[PDB]
């Protein structure tokens, strides 16, 4: 039962694992560098190990230093994505199970790609620069050197020297800070993580912040401009965290925190443990996209806890994750609401699928990243067709409070391990022992390594769907002369998720008339909403449609904020349509040098430039 990472380049588990990360850094602004010590403490795993293999991705290493001595070291020729292979040579061999601690000086280049360093101007404030990372899926080699697969869990310690202005934040629990010793003018800030975890959830950021707390547990940061807004969006977060309890057992991570950071942020959030990270663009003003929470929340489970072994299991952690997440969803706001944004994710699975082709290989639930940017097939498949695998199980094997227990007991028998689908499948098959009739009537490569849409379709409630669906196919089947029959009042029962799911069932069927479109402006005036998901929409829907005056709008949206959700799609739609092409491009080239690096590459290739 042989699964190797064909992600890293760095010794496997089996070879070797480490145990223990020490951080000592210092954050240089001037520069845009992060210099350094990382000491390692790694296990062998086999006997007479002599050397070992570690990632690492543009990182300038000074010396390595063993029992106090200097080691000799060896970096092979980098290898795209997945950088160069770091080789260390031990002083003396190890036998199994003994364990030697490796310090490394190294320093960040100011182009890695885990990073994204903001100039004054770039932030809210305007007097401070600021900095912060996003290791997922495998940019931490591109921070420091380590064996960067998740199939290795470790805790660390850490202390960061950064201005003494400034304040650093990390995915652990704050241990005080104090003046640096080697320099009056900066602040040492330690930061403590007991809990074992994959690397690609260490994070770091470094900025102006302000702290309020909105919890027994939860305290949420971010610039002084955004705390009163930030405080009221996310409020509903220790609820959701008591209903997550109840879900999938303790929380182990004692603190709860959420970090709100700049427009450029890539995601809509990043559950990294002890400190979440969200786009600026949850706050709608309505608390309307909380979901995104509920999502980071759910992981502190599927995902933090229980971890896949290799990126080609991706589903394991998204798949889960989303089904929990839908729960909370369903215990705050109703079982309808739950088949109603269910129903939405197997839209988002037809829209993906549509886009990729039916047969390409990036439709499989279980892909093979071998050659692969994990970056490049990143999309919404092992989210959605994760989700429907565990939905229409949920409804084969009795009823959600059923399949609610086998989760429970996937965590606990899984908890602070990393595992592959088989041991998912074998452990489904051994909680459900009593129902194999049915779980073998499921067409399981099929779905778990068959291209396309999946082989078998739930069965989801309408209730809060019918009236977009009427109101959407109203408008498409709409001529010219029953264009005055509509009317603001069409909106008057609908939430703000309805409104949502109305302007998605129409962009499925884009274009639409221009007509129909400035009459839509015209009634319902969608250019004055705020909440960017609706907004996003709408603005697609108008490019496609080819509505010139949307352009602005549309170009305005793709570079003021950095989602890649948002950014990629309307970079992608404005470069189809002859009118803004030429400006589409122009505008990337002008922004490019200040976007985030991993946004810059992907929009880069979607428009074909460079
Ligand atoms: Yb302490
Ligand atoms: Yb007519
Ligand atoms: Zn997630």
């Not at 912060?132 to 998740?150: E, G, K, N, V, W």
């Not at 739930?458 to 029959?485: F, G, H, V």
């Amino acid at each position: 039962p042989e699964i190797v990472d064909t992600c890293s380049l760095a010794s496997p588990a089996s070879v070797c694992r480490t145990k223990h990360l020490h951080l000592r850094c210092s954050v240089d602004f001037t520069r845009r560098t992060l210099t350094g010590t990382a000491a390692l403490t790694v296990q062998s795993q086999e006997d007479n190990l002599r050397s070992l293999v570690l990632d690492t991705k543009d990182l300038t290493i000074e010396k390595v230093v063993i029992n106090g001595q200097e080691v000799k070291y060896a970096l092979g020729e980098r290898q795209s994505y997945k950088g160069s292979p770091m080789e260390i040579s031990l002083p003396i061999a190890l036998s199994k199970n003994q364990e030697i601690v490796i310090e490394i000086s190294f320093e960040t280049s100011p182009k890695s790609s885990a990073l994204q360093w903001l100039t004054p101007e770039q932030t809210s404030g305007k007097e401070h620069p600021y900095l912060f990372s996003q290791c997922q899926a495998i940019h931490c080699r591109a921070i420091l050197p380590c064996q960067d697969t998740p199939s290795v869990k470790l805790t660390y310690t850490a202390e960061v020297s950064v201005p003494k202005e400034l304040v650093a934040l990390m995915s652990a629990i704050r241990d005080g800070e104090t003046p640096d010793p080697e320099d009056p003018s900066r602040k040492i800030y330690k930061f403590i993580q007991k809990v074992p975890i994959p690397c690609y959830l260490i994070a770091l950021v470094v900025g102006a912040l302000e702290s309020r707390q909105i919890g027994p547990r939860t305290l949420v940061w971010s610039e002084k401009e955004q705390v009163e807004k930030s405080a009221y969006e996310f409020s509903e977060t220790e609820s959701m965290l008591k209903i997550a309890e109840d879900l999938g057992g303790p929380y182990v991570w004692g603190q709860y925190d959420l970090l709100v950071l700049p427009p450029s942020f890539p995601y809509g959030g990043m559950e990294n443990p002890c400190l979440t990270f969200v786009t600026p663009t949850l706050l709608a003003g309505d608390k309307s996209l909380s979901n995104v929470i509920a999502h980071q929340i759910s992981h502190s489970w599927t995902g933090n806890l229980v971890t896949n072994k290799t990126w080609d299991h991706f589903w394991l952690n998204e798949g889960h994750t989303v089904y929990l997440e839908r729960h909370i969803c369903g215990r705050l706001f109703g079982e309808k609401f739950r088949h109603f944004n269910a129903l939405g994710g197997w839209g988002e699975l037809q829209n993906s699928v549509k886009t990729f082709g039916e047969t390409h290989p990036f439709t499989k639930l279980v892909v093979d990243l071998t050659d692969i940017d994990p970056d490049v097939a990143y999309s919404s498949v092992p989210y959605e067709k994760g989700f429907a695998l565990l939905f229409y199980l949920e409804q084969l094997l009795g009823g959600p409070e059923i399949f609610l227990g086998f989760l429970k007991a996937y965590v606990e028998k899984f908890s602070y391990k990393s595992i592959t689908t088989d041991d998912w499948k074998d452990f489904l098959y051994s909680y459900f022992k009593d129902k194999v009739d049915v779980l073998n009537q499921v067409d399981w490569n099929a779905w778990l390594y068959s291209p396309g849409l999946p082989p078998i379709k739930p069965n989801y409630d309408m209730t809060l769907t019918n009236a977009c669906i009427a109101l959407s196919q109203r408008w498409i089947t709409a001529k010219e002369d029953d264009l005055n029959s509509f009317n603001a009042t069409d909106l008057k029962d609908l939430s703000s998720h309805q409104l949502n799911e109305f302007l998605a069932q129409t962009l499925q069927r884009a274009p639409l008339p221009l007509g129909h479109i400035k009459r839509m402006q015209e009634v319902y005036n969608f250019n004055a909403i705020n909440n960017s998901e609706i907004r996003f929409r709408w603005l697609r829907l108008c490019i496609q449609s080819k509505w010139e005056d949307a352009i602005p709008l549309a170009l305005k949206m793709a570079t003021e904020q950095g989602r890649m959700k948002f950014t990629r799609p309307l970079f992608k739609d404005l470069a189809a349509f002859d009118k803004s092409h030429d400006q589409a491009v122009r505008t990337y080239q002008e922004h490019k040098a200040s976007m985030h690096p991993v946004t810059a590459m992907l929009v880069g290739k979607d428009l074909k430039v460079d």
